[PDB]
Amino acid sequence: AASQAVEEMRSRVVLGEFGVRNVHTTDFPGNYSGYDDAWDQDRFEKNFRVDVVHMDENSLEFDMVGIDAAIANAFRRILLAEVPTMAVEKVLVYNNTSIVQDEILAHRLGLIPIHADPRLFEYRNQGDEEGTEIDTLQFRLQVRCTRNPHAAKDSSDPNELYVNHKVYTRHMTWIPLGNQADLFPEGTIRPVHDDILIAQLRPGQEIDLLMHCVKGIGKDHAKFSPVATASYRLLPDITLLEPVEGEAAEELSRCFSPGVIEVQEVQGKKVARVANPRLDTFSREIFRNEKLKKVVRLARVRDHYIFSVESTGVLPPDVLVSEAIKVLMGKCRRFLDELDAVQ
Amino acid sequence: QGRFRGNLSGKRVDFSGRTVISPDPNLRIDEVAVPVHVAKILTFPEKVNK
Amino acid sequence: TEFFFHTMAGREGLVDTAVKTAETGYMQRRLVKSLEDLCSQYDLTVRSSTGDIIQFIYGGDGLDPAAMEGKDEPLEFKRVLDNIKAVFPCPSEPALSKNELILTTESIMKKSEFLCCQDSFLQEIKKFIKGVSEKIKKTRDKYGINDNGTTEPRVLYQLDRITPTQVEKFLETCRDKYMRAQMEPGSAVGALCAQSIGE
Amino acid sequence: DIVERHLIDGDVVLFNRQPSLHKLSIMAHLARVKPHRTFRFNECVCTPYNADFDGDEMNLHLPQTEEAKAEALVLMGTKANLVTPRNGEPLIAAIQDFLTGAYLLTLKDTFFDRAKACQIIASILVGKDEKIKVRLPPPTILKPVTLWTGKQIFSVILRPSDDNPVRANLRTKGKQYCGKGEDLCANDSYVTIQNSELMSGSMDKGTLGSGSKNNIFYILLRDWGQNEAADAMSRLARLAPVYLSNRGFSIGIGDVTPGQGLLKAKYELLNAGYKKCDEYIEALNTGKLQQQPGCTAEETLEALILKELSVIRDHAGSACLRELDKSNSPLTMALCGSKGSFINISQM
Amino acid sequence: TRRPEIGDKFSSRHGQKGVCGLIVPQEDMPFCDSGICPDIIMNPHGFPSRMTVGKLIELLAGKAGVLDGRFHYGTAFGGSKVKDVCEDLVRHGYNYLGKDYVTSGITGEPLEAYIYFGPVYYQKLKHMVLDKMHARARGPRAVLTRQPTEGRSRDGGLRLGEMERDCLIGYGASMLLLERLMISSDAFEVDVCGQCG
Amino acid sequence: AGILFEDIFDVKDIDPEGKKFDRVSRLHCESESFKMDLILDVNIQIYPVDLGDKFRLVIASTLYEDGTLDDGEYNPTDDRPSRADQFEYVMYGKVYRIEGDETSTEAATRLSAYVSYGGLLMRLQGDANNLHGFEVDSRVYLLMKKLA
Amino acid sequence: MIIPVRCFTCGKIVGNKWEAYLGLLQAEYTEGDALDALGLKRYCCRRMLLAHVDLIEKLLNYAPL
Amino acid sequence: KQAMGTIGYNQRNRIDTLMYLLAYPQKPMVKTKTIELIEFEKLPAGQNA
Amino acid sequence: KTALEMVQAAGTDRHCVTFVLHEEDHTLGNSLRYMIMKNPEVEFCGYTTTHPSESKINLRIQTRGTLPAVEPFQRGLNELMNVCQHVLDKFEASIKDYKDQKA
RNA sequence: UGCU
Ligand SMILES: Nc1nc2c(ncn2[C@@H]2O[C@H](COP(=O)(O)OP(=O)(O)OP(=O)(O)O)[C@@H](O)[C@H]2O)c(=O)[nH]1
Ligand SMILES: [Mg+2]
């Protein structure tokens, strides 16, 4: 009926065969007559909830119910760009005989993440290339490739012919400044993966350089981005308009993801049902079968967003989200203070 | 490339540049963007008045 | 074979366009070098550089091709009348009949500002006014509309509703457009013609 | 004294393309400084220059005299040269990615909520448009749900504020107009705008393009001056991209893949054409063939074969257009006239 | 070492040459359910008039290849068909037409139409805006005729050819044409005798 | 009361030219009291309709029954007793054309009002006595309520 | 020339997995199952690792040394 | 004919008046038999994005 | 200097106001837009970007009656801050109980 | 020789 249609338009996002409908957020006062969509902190806090479904090293997955697409995209973009981290900025070279270009080497080194905690540092002021102990970190890299004094007669493999022929990021040595050695314990300031291949050398070549890293946000450059892939997707909710049984059940199971549709024998006949719509990715392969088009109804929940954040290993994703929310709150407080000073 | 066609009818001038174009719908139809590098080179003689 | 034939057609078109570029460049150069001497004077006579007159009046009437609203015509009377009726709707004034419309048109056209206008444009205005008045007469004869203004259904007056204010606005707008669309003295009409024939 | 000042905002500057066909290939614009290294301008002015943004190098000149500056700004003004002297048709009008945007916006299926309507209306409130009222138009449907229509969102461009004296009026036909609806076409292809309010019809190249007369921008230019038309074009160029990006418009292999009925019709038509061609070849070789007037038998056979192939092509194109479903990007673009056509669609 | 910026030209191995129009951040670039953002966004309006179905076929084949860990062949008058790549996509769980559900990055709301994503082999051309940019001050002139030089390497100025002169004449900017062709190009003061001429 | 017209119509066809639009449909309806025909664009997504559906339709000058024509601006947030409370499908449009019938060459008495509800076309055709009060460039409210 | 450290589209650390992918190639693992075991779900990293050509050794063969 | 990419394995020792190289060149995913024959996959001149 | 106010015209009308915000992007713009749209005393609310080169945005707020359009702005900011604090606390509690039930 |  009309009430059911309005409820669907305001709650679910239907995906059609040719296009998606009901994609705009309309839950606002004045748009609906029979609904008082005015802002209510009580109802918001009552309906809002967060449930973590998977949390491991450099990977997090959590469902937020009650939040809106606007705030979801805000959090996503903040995590992507507006989270400050540490990354190599200045590169001082000393007689680099490597075949790799100096600029390409500096870019690769800048793309290397640093496991240092950014909350303990500050942004470098305009200029001041010398850097201060508070807002700078120094990493020395000195690799001299030479022939292996003891090797086989043929030694066709470079691993046996030469030594230190692949300059990995593990060769970086953090040089403390001032009281940083006492502040940070040994082993904390180090490359994240410790296995990134920077370049390859040959006997006679040498790479000697110093890297000064400072605090910076991802908006200025992508090297400061802590999150490798931080995104969110609406919760799928597949519903069957009419009970589908028989070989049509196996057809539905093959059309949808293998982990969303399950077939059961309740009375000796196979009948399909929705088991876990989380694993479904909406491949829209059911539209190929002519008969099975008018039996299902794909939909996305408007107030249920699964956030998946896979980071590079600088700091855990829970603390990343915490810092993103703190940065948003700081922006809000700064704007409030500016408005107060204006008035 | 003669004096009538190459040096009188069509001749080269200064205070001009040549650059590649790119789309930008955020500007009016009667407005054109000029880069800072070409702007610092192309100068205009303004007379000092009151 | 189909791909080869398509490539043949494509290369044919490419070479055709390549020849066309140079051919039209030469033609445009010649046309401009030939027509770069004419210009529109203040006495509405197109003359060359030596003073000889090429035309006593540009195009026979003296209108700007760039300001041509209709298909080789100065104005589109129907569109102008519709725009005037939509921009200035007078709900506090009654409608006009055929005789009243003709009378007000004849009284307004005989003013001084309309004397300097060309006779052809005035004749076209008269013809359009007569046509619209005949249309109004036919509509009123079909729907039994009385010119006295005492017909009970007032909606019948909304079929073809015209007021003296709208008539005057239409006439003034047409006159202003016809006066502003004339050839402005000093324009390189010869060069404009050369470019419009070359492109 | 004389000071050689740098090129700052507000200075008149000549912009030209080296290959010049008509006078509109060079125009005097106002220079604005930007940190990039390229000459940027409104894409609506690409038709005059005949540019395509595929590596074209254009020239930029700076006059060195106040009289020359004034003459360039007045005579060679972009707002004053919106029409060509050849036939008076407007060249500075909507272009690809704008005609399709306006069409999808004014489609009868568009129904925006208050938030989206306000966002689309604010997307243009920049520059000189920051000192004017928004004038949110009343909603069409309000009891079930308050929805603002794309046609009203577009008419907001014509009449952004209340104090704006622009009252646009137009009544014309579209490209896909049937010919008998008389403002009631099933496809809604009869453009009718009254008092700067889109009453009926959908925008396309016939109304927003630079094809011929009856353009909304042309009517604005001829009725309310050049500044109003320039502002309307700027508002359109600033609004259409935002809505197009927020809606999404893409093309895929499924938008051009054929259907089963289409393949069947194509096979039947090809069979019939080959049979008729073989019959004509046999009649010409062995026997007497009907010779058309003014040509020999070989030319008659050539003309008949060409006619049969053209009939096959037209029937295949009609079948493809009838089997293709709406919302298709190639079909929508060919309908709105932004780029492509039914001929290219049937060929591909 | 130069970075791609506004004005750099790029090709897509299909003659669809283009120029860098804008560089939008990653947060502004749209994102799909998996979180992949597009590196290049091309204009779909170029497909109808050019009939470049080969580009779509290449994109679909490349998507299938990167999904199944294979290298599809685009051999002329042959190669991998569309059905094979569609089967690969439907087996790997992606749409059989390339179009995937994508959410807008600016507004955070899903798009009404699906976006056509896929890996395309883009190649950069030597035409650089940094090299094609030119701005000529007074600079030097030629000995024979006191006018700016021709080439950019020799610091040459632009040429107001016969077509430009014709356009200026048609416009009627007499003072502009004079300042261009006489004052700012080859201005000079000579001495003429009124007796012999 | 600002009721300009009111009548019960019955739908005779949904899409004579096919399913052109997904959300909007061109319904053709005929009145029972008089010979009033209505060609109206309706939104079926938010207000579904069928072929054999009958509905009362009222075209009024204002939305308030008290007669207050103060319609300078509409505030959906304001709650007050109005005419929309007695109906289900409310639209706001403007009567943009009034055209007489051209089929009858003589003794014609049929007119037709074309209204544009934000693009949605509504042609109400019939005897002129029923269209009393309709004027060009006049904004009005349409109220449709289905019956049993 | 050399495997990039970051991926163009997303930015996941992929330079550290180049030697692992080479080892998987020397082993009996195919491209598909090797990229699957390396932990690359999204196709961007799969493409980054598969379409990459190893020319650093070809250049070092010409290096002065 | 103007595409940017690697020239050969001796491009570092080669000294020409003008050379354009790519940082991270990648071989195409959809490669042709002609590509395999000419060995262009070994010296690609573009990247897959 | 970060956030500046502008009236609709020289008349200094407080019903319609424009807030120009520097060093910002679509994130805070859309967040504040969504948080202030639910205010029943707002007729129109819309954020836009001047040019992608410069980092600044322009929000425009037109109220219903005689609201200065600055109190709705402050209300939206406070509501956004409260929502941020609430979601932060909820996420912290969620992570804490998740670690507790995992260990 | 390339570019539009
Ligand atoms: N890069 C470049 N090479 C040229 C150019 N002109 C000539 N060449 C070389 O010369 C050949 C053709 O040039 P021509 O047009 O015969 O030289 P030309 O006829 O003297 O040309 P003009 O100097 O204009 O008369 C080409 O096939 C090139 O080998 C040029 O302008 N640029
Ligand atoms: Mg070009």
Ligand SMILES: [Zn+2]
């Ligand atoms: Zn003498």
Ligand SMILES: [Zn+2]
């Ligand atoms: Zn990746």
